[PDB]
Amino acid sequence: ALIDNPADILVIAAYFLLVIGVGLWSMRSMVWWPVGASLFASNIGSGHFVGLAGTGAASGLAVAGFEWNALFVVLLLGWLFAPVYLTAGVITMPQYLRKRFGGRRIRLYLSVLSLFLYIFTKISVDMFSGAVFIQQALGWNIYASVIALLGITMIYTVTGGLAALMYTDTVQTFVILGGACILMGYAFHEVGGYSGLFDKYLGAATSLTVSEDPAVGNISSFCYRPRPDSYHLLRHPVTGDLPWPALLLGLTIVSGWYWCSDQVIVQRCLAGKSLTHIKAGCILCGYLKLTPMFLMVMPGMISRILYPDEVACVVPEVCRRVCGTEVGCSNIAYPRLVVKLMPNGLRGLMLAVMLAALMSSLASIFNSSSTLFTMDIYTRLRPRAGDRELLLVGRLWVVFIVVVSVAWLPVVQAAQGGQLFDYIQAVSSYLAPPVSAVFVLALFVPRVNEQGAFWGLIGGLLMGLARLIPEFSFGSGSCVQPSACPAFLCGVHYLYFAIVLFFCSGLLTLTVSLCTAPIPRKHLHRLVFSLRHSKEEREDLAAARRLEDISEDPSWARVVNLNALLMMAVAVFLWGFYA
Amino acid sequence: XXXXXXXXXXXXXXXXXXXXXXXXXXXXXXXXXXXXXXXXXXXXXXXXXXXXXXXXXXXXXXXXXXXXXXXXXXXXXXXXXXXXXXXXXXXXXXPXXXXXXXXXXX
Amino acid sequence: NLQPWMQGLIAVAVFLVLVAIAFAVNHFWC
């Protein structure tokens, strides 16, 4: 409906032709900048656009801390976790845990858990975001949009558009950043510039605030007005929607799982030619992670300014007519800005950019999940599996998880307040912190053994489920309709719960490990951070040596370290600037 | 219910002079102010909204400014046709409220 | 109050002080 003009159809078709042509033409080596671009492209998908813009429209600046916190955890990956992964000679994170602790249950459990996390927070989220973009562009329902997105994804995979070339994610990162820059320029032009956004945001509210539902009736000002601390990154510890202690500590835990314990990102970073290239790509990715504040969040705030009756709908029936979700319609923030603000031709370009972000993230996720199932689940049951059956099983597993994610999609649309990023980060905060705790204790506390690790993972799963299940079962509330969560189980912010779950999992891990037999030191050479440069042979629980070498020349190591310090100082300045 | 106050009920300027019509909100509206012009026999027409954004078609003589609670509409070169009633409206909250209206005469 | 650039510079000063502290800890007793 909105891309029905010849210019939009032409630009979309040109992008599809280029993608199909490059995919059909396809018929440890990466240097630092491909590594950084790959990390950024794998991380940033259409879910990031939808969620960051929606939370910026709904709440303001603080959501940028979800991307700005990633600089420090990417430096953790480059300087603490990547060395250990490279010296351990691992291809999957469950494989590292298998080397570190032994046994076969931690690897299997972590594979299954990671696949569930990909279905929940990664695949279904991206499918939902693409469907929302198709809804705004074509005026379709959510299910026609999902079917269309599945069809185009099937075309992408059949034509081979998800194949990984040497500089594919570099081009994807360039296209994402260029499209986001064009839309950011148009959006800032609409509001009268950078200062126009901050002039206008706090006054932008919908004029439709009375509901015909007698239970709702007059909706309070607190529910439709922009938050008073909308321009502040650091918000109140108990009343803030993103309290600063939770945004700085629990978000560090969740981001640490995301960047240092997760196959999607680590599989990209482990392709670096050297450790200096991995560290420099970490610096580049961290610098690129400062961009979603101005390319996603502030455009979402501008979207609230421009379309307050749609993006900031408060009345449940008005919201149901706007986006189909009665609890809020902020997810259409970036979609609407693409279709209502971009002119003919550039609107199709922005749709192509969103599809490119979606497809780069999906390529990373599909590769990682197929690898996980193939090497950590399937090959355990079929050790004699040939390459052909492994490849076929991987493709079929990818198809299976895509179907399962589409099945899960109703939960994703039932995000709390109708905010996708809240759903992503809450599920991450309920399921990830046990993995963060176990990976940290594995890397840095050699006394932790297989018993402590596995039972910390299981106990963390139990304690995080005692939060996840009531959160979903009680339904999706909003400010207008708050839902019947007991408010001791859901009143606490999910990043505070990430802190609590991380510390409870670490405590259970340490306590079970200290009550059982320790792992002898000879089994932990080059597996713990304490023994990266250990040259002894280890009892596992030429070319390979060059694969497992993390010795870097002092000059470029010093240059990379100084650039990491400079990037941290720039990030700290930005944190203070918007504090 | 926000109260918009126009301190001067009446302003007289010669043709070619610059006139500033002031509006004061009862609270801090985040530049959420519109200016309307109503000529004697006609209905109001939007000049400005967001306190500075000119409506489509209004001349560059009409310039809005202000922040917090204090807003102004300036006519840089008043023409003999500029005599009218100028209203400030807040679009910060609902119900929309208007200023009393300042009558610009020549 | 403080301008946002003044807050940023204060944050950078705190970061550099912490960097010096971490370097001293690294140099003296690992």
Ligand SMILES: OC[C@H]1O[C@H](O)[C@H](O)[C@@H](O)[C@@H]1F
């Ligand atoms: O869940 C934590 C993650 O949340 C989002 O995906 C951010 O873009 C990542 O930087 C962060 F690591």
Ligand code: NA
């Ligand atoms: Na992506």
